[PDB]
Design a binder for this molecule. Structure first.
Ligand SMILES: Nc1nc(N)nc(-c2ccccc2Cl)n1
Length: 208
């Protein structure tokens, strides 16, 4: 059973802007996704301080970067708080409608696409390098779900079974044909060192 949803007009317009605007500095997508993973890990850590049973679904707090040259995918995995089905549908737990407006108002005031994360819509920078994004998530209070979108104004949500993750989120970037540099170990290392060198969780770059 697959449910299909329309993006709010402002988010569809943001995604169109990210896909169609000429902007060479695409590598910033990884900083944005690692930042989101770090925020999610902070949230489950904070909840666990008063309720240790919140970590029964996994005590390890980490971020994994997994490139797959055969599938042409780059996956960002974390063991953070994860998201409920309601969160996924409601713009992946964000205020993306007001965030998009604040980003647009900033772009007109002298901002560039690299400042997208300041407006709480950094996730959508994934569409700088991906033709499709799959978000697999598991929150302690809900079942495992898969969100997916190839932009075009809609996203899908379905239950995800067979590979239970315990708790957290997996962001699967199905890369554009001309963006395979983001599967290369030296390129990922370079971007992590440049933009995410002080993240407070272990970042493990998987090899093939
Ligand atoms: N890694 C991760 N974990 C959560 N909980 N939310 C996010 C998130 C935050 C904002 C927009 C989109 C996503 Cl997928 N990412």
């Amino acid at each position: 059973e697959v449910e299909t949803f329309a993006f709010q007009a402002e988010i569809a317009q943001l995604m169109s802007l990210i896909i169609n605007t000429f902007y060479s500095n695409k590598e910033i997508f990884l900083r944005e996704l690692i930042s989101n993973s770090s925020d999610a890990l902070d949230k489950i850590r904070y909840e666990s301080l008063t309720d240790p049973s919140k970590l029964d679904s996994g005590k390890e707090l980490h971020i994994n970067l997994i490139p797959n040259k055969q599938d042409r995918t780059l996956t960002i995995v974390d063991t953070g708080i994860g998201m409920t089905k309601a969160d996924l549908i409601n713009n992946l737990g964000t205020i993306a409608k007001s965030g998009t407006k604040a980003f647009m108002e900033a772009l007109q005031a002298g901002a560039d696409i690299s400042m997208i994360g300041q407006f709480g819509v950094g996730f959508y920078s994934a569409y700088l390098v991906a033709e499709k994004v799959t978000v697999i998530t598991k929150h302690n209070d809900d079942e495992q779900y898969a969100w997916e979108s190839s932009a075009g104004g809609s996203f899908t949500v379905r239950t995800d079974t067979g590979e239970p993750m315990g708790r957290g989120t997996k962001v699967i970037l199905h890369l554009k044909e001309d963006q395979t540099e983001y599967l290369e170990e030296r390129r990922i290392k370079e971007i992590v060192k440049k933009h995410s060198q002080f993240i407070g969780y272990p970042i493990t770059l998987f090899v093939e």
